[PDB]
């Protein structure tokens, strides 16, 4: 029931829940952006992301289980369902500015969540999570 | 080997418009998002837009949003750009560019492969 | 959108040299900056990626460095054929900017 976590390298964060299985990546390319994309402020919002509920469902369950608060957290992003490019959602978590203060929530979660968090946003930098689909890794448990 | 293919030089009359082509070879033309950069004579880059094949995507510089027109042909591997009401200002070199789609941090997201230019000059 | 300010549009050097070009990011782009070399009527051919990495057969000279929003690219030693145009680009983040430019000239 619960979804599976997996570490690859101390680098690599990967997830698992059904039928979706996501790659976890963090660095400074803003994929999204409020002015392109979907922004979510409710979980009910993320429909628009996908086609597929195990998608849907997964995502909003790492969004829980890292303390995310949909209405006084910042809102977050992902791709409209109607694109072809792929499903994709993505959070702020750059410890720099106004975002402090969640991107400090947020890291917390993750190491709450991942056994060796390998937390490679530095302080000041412009660092966003990317959640994308890929195949479970073979070295993964 | 990677290679784009850009079309010949431009000859238009002022009002009228021209559709640049950008022909990608020896990749996944799928994979990238084709960028378009202008060169005025004796002056610097500047960033048009972009297009993602796959759906016809777009993301522009504002300063072209109703001069371009991005385009592109998945079958072909062709991008294409339509300039529309040609004016002095729209004489110079264009380039189009590749940009990898986003998947993770170990791929390289600058523009790695460049078009060799197409000359567009506008005169009565 | 982010704009990329760059430091002066011509440079005069000498050949032996040590010559710095800056780019200064409006906001924080990370490292998400790239260095293009362009010589007259040819293609910009890419020199770095993610501020410091030098692409595919660029040699060890060029030498690209970051400190917050200030970007800088490097030349340790000038060579002849290194005389050409110099643009920051930031990629972070669409619409992708261009720095306007730094066109190295020969001190005589």
């Known amino acids: 029931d619960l979804p599976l976590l997996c570490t690859l390298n101390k680098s690599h964060l990967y997830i698992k829940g059904g039928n979706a299985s996501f790659k976890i990546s963090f660095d400074d390319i803003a994929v999204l952006l409020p002015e392109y994309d979907v922004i979510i402020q409710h979980p009910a919002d993320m429909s628009w992301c996908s086609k597929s509920d195990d998608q849907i469902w997964l995502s909003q369950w790492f969004m829980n289980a890292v303390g995310h608060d949909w209405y006084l957290d910042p809102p977050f992003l992902c791709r409209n369902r109607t694109k072809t490019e792929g499903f994709i959602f993505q959070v702020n978590t750059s410890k720099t500015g106004i975002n402090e203060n969640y991107a400090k929530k947020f890291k917390t979660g993750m190491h709450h969540l991942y056994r060796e968090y390998p937390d490679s946003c530095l302080d000041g930098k412009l660092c966003l999570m990317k959640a994308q689909p890929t195949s479970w890794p073979l070295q993964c448990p | 080997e990677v290679k784009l293919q850009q079309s010949g030089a431009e000859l238009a009359r002022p009002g009228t418009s021209v559709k640049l082509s950008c022909k990608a070879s020896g990749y996944t033309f799928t994979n990238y998002w084709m960028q378009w950069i202008k060169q005025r004579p004796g002056q610097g880059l500047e960033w048009i837009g972009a297009?993602?094949?796959?759906?016809?995507?777009?993301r522009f510089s504002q300063k072209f949003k109703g001069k371009a027109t991005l385009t592109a042909d998945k079958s072909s591997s062709t991008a294409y750009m339509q300039l529309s009401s040609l004016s002095s200002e729209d004489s110079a070199v264009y380039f189009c560019?590749?940009?990898?789609?986003?998947?993770?941090?170990?791929?390289?997201?600058?523009?790695?492969?460049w078009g060799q230019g197409t000359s567009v000059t506008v005169s009565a | 959108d982010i704009v990329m300010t760059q430091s002066q549009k011509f440079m005069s050097t000498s050949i032996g040299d040590r010559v710095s070009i800056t780019c200064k990011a409006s906001?924080?782009?990370?490292?998400?900056v790239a260095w293009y070399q362009q010589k007259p009527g040819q293609s910009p051919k890419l020199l770095i990626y993610?501020?410091?990495n030098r692409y595919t057969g660029v040699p060890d000279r060029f030498i690209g460095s970051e400190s917050g929003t200030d970007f800088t690219l490097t030349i340790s030693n000038m060579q002849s054929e290194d005389l050409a145009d110099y643009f920051c680009?930031?990629?972070?983040?669409?619409?992708?900017?261009f720095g306007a430019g730094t066109k190295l000239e020969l001190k005589r």
């Open positions: 680009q930031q990629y972070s983040s669409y619409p992708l900017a």
């Open positions: 993610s501020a410091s």
């Open positions: 297009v993602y094949p796959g759906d016809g995507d777009t």
């Open positions: 906001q924080n782009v990370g490292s998400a």
């Open positions: 560019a590749r940009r990898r789609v986003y998947y993770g941090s170990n791929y390289i997201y600058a523009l790695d492969y």
